[PDB]
Paper text:
ArdK is a 102 amino acid protein encoded by the broad host range conjugative plasmid R388. In R388, ArdK represses the expression of five genes by its binding to their respective promoters (PardC, Porf7, Pssb, Porf12 and Porf14). The KorA family of transcriptional regulators includes plasmid-borne repressors involved in plasmid stability and conjugation. Our structural analyses show that ArdK, a member of this family, can form a symmetric dimer similar to that observed for KorA, yet it binds direct sequence repeats as a non-symmetric dimer.
ArdK was crystallized as described in the Materials and Methods, and resolved to 3.0 Å resolution. In the crystal of the apo structure, there is a single ArdK molecule in the asymmetric unit. This molecule contains an N-terminal HTH domain (residues 1–62) and a C-terminal domain with a C-terminal α-helix (residues 75–102) connected by a linker region (residues 63–74). The C-terminal domain forms a β-sheet with its symmetry-related molecule. Thus, the biological assembly is very probably a dimer containing two HTH domains (α1–α4) and a dimerization domain (DD, β1 and α5). In fact, according to S75 gel filtration data, the protein purified as a dimer in solution. The structure of the HTH and DD domains in ArdK is strikingly similar to the structure of these domains in KorA. Both the HTH and the DD of ArdK show a root mean square deviation (RMSD) of 0.83 Å and 1.35 Å with their respective homologue domains in KorA. Comparison between both structures revealed that both dimers are symmetrical, but the orientation of the HTH differs: in ArdK, the HTH domains are rotated 150° with respect to their position in KorA. As a consequence, the electropositive N-terminal ends of the recognition α4 helices point towards each other in KorA, whereas they are pointing in opposite directions in ArdK.
Residue numbers in the entry:
A (entry chain A), B (entry chain A): 13 to 106
Amino acid sequence: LGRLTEETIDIAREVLVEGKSQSDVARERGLSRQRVSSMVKSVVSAANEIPREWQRVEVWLPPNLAEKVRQMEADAKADVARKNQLTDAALEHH
Amino acid sequence: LGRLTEETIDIAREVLVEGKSQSDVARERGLSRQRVSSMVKSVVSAANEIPREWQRVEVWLPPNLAEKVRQMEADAKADVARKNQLTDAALEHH
């Protein structure tokens, strides 16, 4: 929900609100399966405020190491935030 | 599926095969909600071959660190295996 074409928002909205399968929607608009699935993916990663190359992982493990993995995530997410505001300033003269 | 009472297997089998909610099954047998949910949990962790105190975690993160987390799991799982066979031998005389 930011800077995206109008078509990307209209396709994507019909599967995540009022739940319909991806296959059916291909035939009605006349698009490949590969491309309807690349449209849904860039709206999900924009609602999370993270780049598009990051991946999703899920495992079982003991309780001490289960805490160290929760912390890797939280610190890495606030580091993109700081480093992004700095390069916006550098392009406003000064 | 190993060394468990007969009741624990008969309750647990009715929710995971032929899918029924946990609430309904409480009333018919006359047990609390807390205890039907502690019966289902020890059959799942026995099909994984891991202790009952381990926890389940799921996060998003960059592609290099996404590999190091996949490897923590695999090594920790083969370490319980080796250390278990050793204490069985020590109790067989010698």
